């Protein structure tokens, strides 16, 4: 499934690292959905999603307030990593609007699997953003 990142580098204090907090927050809201949803109807995943999407708005903001300060040269990979998370959310939505459009159908259970898929992507990528930015602080230091 190839490519993998070793654990977040230990060489950086995480006490006031709001990126690490927000990523952890976003991954956590995905896990909430990804692990509840199987059961519940549209009156329960639609927010479960809005939640994930709020937790992302935050992370993206915090990353905005964080890029200025890093090396100018590493601003592009981080801006890209961010847009990727945007489309990841877009997929999640498309597959939600679909699970809705087809309730109490054989197709409802399917667009749900597609949601879980899209939300997993989101989290994996939220973790890759953090990975990039860390390399960006490492650079700025050494």
């Amino acid at each position: 499934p190839q490519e993998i990142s070793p654990p977040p580098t230990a060489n950086l204090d995480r006490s006031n690292d709001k990126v690490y907090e927000n990523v952890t927050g976003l991954v956590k809201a995905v896990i909430e959905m990804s692990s509840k949803i199987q059961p519940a109807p549209p009156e329960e995943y639609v927010p479960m999603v809005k939640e994930v999407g709020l937790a992302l708005r935050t992370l993206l903001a915090t990353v905005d307030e964080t890029i200025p300060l890093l090396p100018a040269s590493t601003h592009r990979e981080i801006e890209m990593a961010q847009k990727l998370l945007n489309s990841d959310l877009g997929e999640l939505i498309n597959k939600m609007k679909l699970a809705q459009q087809y309730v109490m159908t054989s197709l409802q259970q399917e667009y749900k699997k597609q949601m879980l898929t899209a939300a997993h992507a989101l989290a994996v990528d939220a973790k890759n953003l953090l990975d990039v930015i860390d390399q960006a602080r490492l650079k700025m230091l050494g």
């Binding site: 999603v49 809005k50 999407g53 708005r57 959310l89 877009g90 939505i93």
Partner: peptide, 12 residues
């Protein structure tokens, strides 16, 4: 971000 917000709006 306006686009992320346009998505968020759809959820409300």
């Amino acid at each position: 971000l306006s686009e992320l917000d346009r998505l968020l709006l759809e959820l409300n």
